[PDB]
Design a protein around this ligand. Structure first.
Ligand code: 12B
Ligand code: 12B
Lengths: 158, 158
């Protein structure tokens, strides 16, 4: 009786932090969705430090502490995902964490750029993926945070 | 006598692979520089597979096998570094590898964008760093592959 109970935790990776509201609207939506399932969101801006290295270390620790990352790999400042988010996905991959990704634009990279090269003649990947192939681990690329979260619930039970 | 001798290895992360020559000119320069010091370059396109997941896995393994990563975080398709490279930097950080980064543009992000926000009113980081703060671990940001390599030689001896 009164055994320890693990509360599931998801690291909320993505460029919402750069919204004018520092991601408040996104994180609030995430908080409400996860609350219903007794899942804790690990949010990049929580208890935010002032020094870059401290912010970075705390985020790395959240990834170490999580059961899954849900990463927003939507276009950021062009057709490419946010590099901070990409770093976090790599961290999670190395730590053998469940990584779930979504994007607002699921078109292949070559469809996005409209060619096999960009405007400067740099190669656009041709693997039938919406973004850099390093970011794809075989799990479906979802359309939304919600759809990724449904996969989490089905595949990481309490 | 005849003890095993470790050959130092560096993972060569960066968007050179997207050059029209698939990085040949960049990688050849790297190869020539490293051979002089008996250091082996681990190059993303070496023995390249055909399936995205196989390429990804081989690159992650190269990072697991390396002594350091030297990562080209130069502007790619705008002021942001390449997300594949960022993923690799994250992978290396999680694995406690030495990570050395360089860029052709060392200006602060706010100097690059000319404002604290981009054209779409999205926040530009203000930490006096040239790129997303997740990509900075306290080691100096170098100006070139060569200067990063000099740090490697001074800080990872045979
Ligand atoms: O790159 C970032 N990772 C982060 C985690 C938490 C907060 C903030 C704020 C600005 C920029 C970044 C950031
Ligand atoms: O995103 C990539 N990581 C890679 C590692 C090695 C080769 C190639 C080729 C195209 C695209 C990518 C790539």
């Amino acid at each position: 009786h009164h055994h320890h109970h693990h509360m599931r935790k998801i690291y909320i990776a993505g460029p919402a932090v750069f919204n004018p509201d520092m991601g408040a609207s996104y994180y609030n939506k995430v908080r409400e969705l996860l609350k219903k399932e007794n899942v804790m969101p690990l949010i990049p801006t929580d208890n935010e430090a002032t020094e870059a290295l401290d912010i970075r270390q705390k985020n790395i620790q959240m990834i170490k502490d999580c059961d899954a990352v849900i990463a927003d790999l939507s276009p950021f400042r062009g057709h490419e995902p946010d590099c901070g988010t990409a770093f976090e996905v790599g961290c999670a991959a190395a730590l053998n964490k469940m990584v779930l990704t979504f994007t607002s634009d699921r078109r292949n990279m070559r469809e996005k750029y409209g060619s096999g090269v960009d405007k400067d003649n740099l190669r656009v990947e041709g693997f039938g993926l919406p973004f850099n192939l390093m970011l794809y681990d075989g799990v479906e690329v979802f359309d939304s945070f919600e759809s990724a979260f449904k996969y989490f619930l089905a595949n990481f039970p309490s």
